[PDB]
């Protein structure tokens, strides 16, 4: 789920 992007996630 765009692993590389990092940042907030809904999870």
């Amino acid at each position, epitope marked *: *789920g*765009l692993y590389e*992007w*990092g*940042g*907030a996630r*809904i999870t």
Partner: antibody
Amino acid sequence: QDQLQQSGAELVRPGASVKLSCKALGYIFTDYEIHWVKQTPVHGLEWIGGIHPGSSGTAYNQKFKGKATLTADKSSTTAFMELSSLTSEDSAVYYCTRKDYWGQGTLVTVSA
Amino acid sequence: DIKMTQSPSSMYTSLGERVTITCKASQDINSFLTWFLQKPGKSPKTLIYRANRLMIGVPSRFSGSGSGQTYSLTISSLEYEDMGIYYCLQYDDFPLTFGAGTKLDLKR
């Protein structure tokens, strides 16, 4: 892996509801968050919220929580966003994004 | 919310020149910054993610930010294709918040 397709322009009356679609293609639907953003001349870019098509989790902005309803349909790999109790301040461009790639936009005009 | 402050608001540049737009976040956004271009009549195009990674496709004239709380997208040499409004976005936390954009126009 590819892209996002938004539904065409909506011309709705005040007091009414609308439902925008964000069909996703070329990747695994239930693995990537879809978020909903709103564009206007006054405020510019605004985030309405997000959905996780796989877990069904949702994150809303406090500005649109009483007016927005995010859903998703795995079978058709479409994100739904429902905007209710339409007011003249809901007239705008609504985008669905997967953060790296974006839909083209859905113009919604509320008018009496 | 994280007030995102993007300056300038607009700018007058010429082909060949070096552009710099800055993004300032009200907190440490842990390099969770994205840069993107709105070409008039079009849906945003992502250019740079997590502060400094160029999206695939993007030309290498485009380059990104810093860390901590102020970030920048530098355009080495300006090309016509690059005219649109630029926008930064933090995704460190919710809600997601955008900077107010920077419009680029050709100068005379």
